[PDB]
């Protein structure tokens, strides 16, 4: 009944943070929908490289927004306290929706 | 051709809308030709 | 859809067209319209350096003012 979203710029942090959230959620309660990787919001920027006039040879860097949807079925009180027990991940943005 | 802004190919090149390149083909159209027979 | 008028020019209308007729009186803000209650007044349009006296006929109605005053002093042997 709950959907939590994990967005980051870093794959070992969603991998390990979603790893331990799935670990705690499985070892504290019942069957829970797995982490579905929904695709990478990735976007590119072209930076004019030299300060003055060199229009060719620029620097286009790309930022990658990884994200995983992960769904827990049944709200149990010690399971809500299990998830809210873990203020663990270092930056990974977590969201809640129905 | 493509600069011919009174056409459909010209408005498609210009990224604009008028008679010849319509939004919602039900709505908005120039006069209709009647070759008939 | 609405004619644009600089408000000090509107106060020039409300000062001369209410009391009494007058003369060369200066304006800035070139972008104003004609406003046919201005006909017969002479408007001083800024041209980059000075203000020009331009008499306003009723034929000049329906435009903006700096079409009447050129800004480039191109005499020209280019």
């Amino acid at each position: 009944k709950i959907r939590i979203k994990l967005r980051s710029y870093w794959v070992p942090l969603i991998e390990d943070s979603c790893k331990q959230i799935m670990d705690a959620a499985r070892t504290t309660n019942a069957k829970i929908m797995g982490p579905v990787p929904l695709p990478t919001k990735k976007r590119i920027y072209c930076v004019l490289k030299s300060p003055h006039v060199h229009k060719d040879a620029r620097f286009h860097f790309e930022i990658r927004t990884h994200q995983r949807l992960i769904d827990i079925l049944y709200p149990t009180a010690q399971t809500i306290d299990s998830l809210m027990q873990l203020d663990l991940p270092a930056g990974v943005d977590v969201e809640v929706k129905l | 051709g493509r600069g011919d802004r009174k056409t459909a190919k010209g408005k498609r090149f210009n990224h604009s809308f008028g008679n010849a390149r319509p939004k919602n083909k039900n709505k908005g159209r120039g006069p209709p030709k009647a070759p008939i027979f | 859809k609405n004619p644009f008028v600089a408000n000090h020019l509107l106060r020039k209308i409300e000062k001369l067209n209410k009391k009494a007729e007058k003369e060369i009186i200066v304006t800035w803000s070139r972008a104003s319209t004609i406003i046919p209650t201005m006909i017969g007044h002479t408007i001083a349009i800024h041209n980059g350096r000075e203000h020009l006296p331009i008499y306003i006929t009723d034929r000049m109605v329906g435009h903006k003012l700096g079409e009447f005053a050129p800004t480039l002093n191109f005499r020209g042997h280019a």
Partner: protein, 99 residues
Amino acid sequence: ARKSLIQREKKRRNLEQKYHLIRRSSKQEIRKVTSLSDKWEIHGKLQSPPRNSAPARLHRRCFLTGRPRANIRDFGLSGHILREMVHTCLLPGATRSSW
């Protein structure tokens, strides 16, 4: 840029938030012409006396240096400064992909 122009954008922004909602919520009522069409010309006179509070006049410079041009708006920084805040591990996620 120069030291003056950053504070030009600063004091112009103070005039934005000074009566932003007041004057442009007034314009929310002017353009509503269901009641009348011909009148309110003078009321453009009341539209007039905000001058530097026109949001058309408000730029967005690079906050770290101040180049008015090539400001990638999603970062707030300029062109050339954005390299050395990618190349110094400072921007998160800037993985310099060359796909």
